[PDB]
Symmetry: none
Subunit: 71 residues, 2 copies
């Protein structure tokens, strides 16, 4: 049935995961660079960490979904 994952669906999710892995890498590096520059811009820590967290959380969900889909 349409509900169940297909090779086509898996290929698409793989594609989404790869674009997001790049974006996640960007936030990782930006957070790293923030920490390395401390104390400058310490007021930006929580915001930057939240943004970074959200992208990695989404990435982790999709990766776990992909594994389950592939099956």
């Amino acid at each position: 049935t349409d509900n169940n994952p297909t090779p086509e669906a898996v290929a698409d999710l793989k594609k989404k995961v790869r674009k997001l892995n790049s974006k996640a890498g960007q936030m990782k590096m930006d957070l790293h660079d923030l920490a390395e520059g401390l104390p400058t811009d310490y007021e930006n820590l929580v915001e930057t960490a939240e943004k970074t967290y959200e992208i990695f959380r989404e990435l982790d969900q999709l990766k776990k979904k992909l594994n389950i889909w592939e099956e």
Copy 2:
């Protein structure tokens, strides 16, 4: 079949409750009041997933 979709669904629920309990733990003492209800739900889902997987595996053998 199609136990497989049913196992897939529990697999996902199990993964989410794992995340939820992990986060709740790391966040302590915040929401310590929610520990037992979350553990009970997580246990129920993993138990049911365990059994259903065993069933699918007798099936498919």
